[PDB]
């Protein structure tokens, strides 16, 4: 899938998907779900 | 029932994990979880409305034969034949008395199975196993 560019606008993150831009606010619960789906080795490489 | 427990009433669709645990005493299907719940703290009665025999947790076994009366006959003839160990050589090749002894042990199995002359046959069983 297409990973959007993420920028912060205050206290929330917005992601602009590329146009074959689709910009929308990224909900915190979505990011929490994604971070839960991150495997151990993945964030271990990230330093976590 | 045929698929599902009588107390916890868990079908094989929703909880496929528990096993066919049956009483050797009152002969009632029940799940493994009901045994681990009720009878872990101590012995109790049969949990249904109508049977209340005192049974132990460690006496529970799996059901080999899906029929109940057949399994009852199975367990009583294990319980009887263990002390009834007489062969042809024990009769020194006497076929008629060996056949009569086989008829006698079959008859006492039948009497314990139907439970009609249970007292006298039980007395004879204890007197035989004491010798």
């Amino acid at each position: 899938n297409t990973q959007p560019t993420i920028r912060k606008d205050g206290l929330k993150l917005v992601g602009s998907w590329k146009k074959d831009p689709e910009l929308r606010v990224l909900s915190t619960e979505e990011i929490l779900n994604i971070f839960k789906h991150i495997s151990v080795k993945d964030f271990t490489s990230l330093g976590f | 029932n045929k698929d599902m427990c009588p107390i916890c009433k868990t079908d094989r669709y929703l909880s496929p994990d528990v096993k066919f645990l049956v009483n050797p005493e009152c002969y009632h299907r029940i799940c493994e979880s009901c045994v681990d719940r009720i009878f872990s703290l101590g012995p109790a009665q049969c949990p249904y409305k109508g049977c209340d025999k005192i049974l132990r947790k460690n006496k529970f076994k799996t059901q080999i034969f899906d029929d109940v009366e057949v399994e009852k006959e199975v367990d009583i003839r294990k319980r009887v034949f263990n002390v009834f160990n007489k062969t042809i050589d024990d009769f020194n090749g006497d076929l008629v008395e060996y056949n009569k002894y086989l008829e006698e042990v079959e008859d006492i199995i039948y009497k314990l199975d139907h439970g009609i002359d249970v007292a006298k046959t039980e007395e004879k069983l204890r007197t035989y196993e004491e010798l």
Partner: protein
């Protein structure tokens, strides 16, 4: 049409009469009757208010019963509004019902497991619970009563354990009321479920009225990478 569609409709109807109130029954019966519905059409059919459908739509979205579609079309007067469409995903709905009933029976079996534990003790002044293990260390020099640490008052026996038969009766009285759901899920598992969507649920639509403001034609877009 499809007998499996009738089975899942009967399953959804049974669970909505069972674990839901009358307005949820009306909403789900409207969805199962008119396969694809919008907000204005639902307001026309049910005479429901926005502050009244709010709890309804929130509950059936939280319980994962109605799939919502975010589609905006262009009316000829160019007053385009974000209209919402309500349809049902049969495999997602039956999996949600399966998980809810499994966690219900697991919770109530755990309740029956934990109610076999003895009564324990509880101090009426401080209103703090105590199990059987720490009652021994609260025993006094008289070797009779269990004195509270903070209140210095003898503990009373909590009324838990005598309701174990009540929990068993609750368990049986729940399970004889769920057996048609068990049979419907057995019949579903013995068959195959076709996963539908908005474009597929539009095949069996029933028009609510003659003039619906929300069109039922999907407008594709180019460059969307959701």
């Amino acid at each position: 049409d499809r007998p499996i569609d009738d089975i899942v409709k009967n399953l959804l109807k049974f669970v909505v009469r069972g674990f839901y109130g009358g307005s949820f029954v009306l909403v789900l019966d409207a969805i199962l009757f008119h396969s694809v519905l919008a907000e204005d059409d639902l307001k026309q059919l049910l005479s429901i208010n926005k502050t009244e459908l709010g709890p309804l739509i929130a509950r059936l979205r939280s319980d994962r019963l109605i799939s919502i579609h975010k589609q905006r079309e262009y009316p000829p007067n160019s007053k385009s509004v974000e209209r919402v469409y309500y349809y049902v995903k049969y495999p997602h709905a039956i999996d949600a019902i399966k998980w809810k009933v499994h966690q219900v029976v697991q919770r109530l079996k755990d309740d029956l497991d934990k109610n076999s534990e003895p009564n324990g003790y509880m101090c009426p002044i401080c209103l703090t619970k105590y199990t059987q293990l720490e009652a021994v260390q609260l025993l006094n020099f008289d070797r009779t009563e269990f004195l509270c640490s903070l209140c210095d008052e003898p503990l009373v026996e909590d009324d838990s354990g005598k309701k174990n038969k009540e929990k068993q009766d609750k368990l049986n009285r729940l399970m004889d009321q769920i057996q048609p759901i068990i049979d419907s899920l057995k019949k579903i598992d013995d068959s195959r479920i076709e996963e539908n969507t908005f474009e597929i649920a539009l095949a069996r639509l029933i028009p609510p009225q003659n003039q619906s403001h929300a069109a039922y034609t999907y407008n594709p877009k180019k460059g969307s990478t959701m």
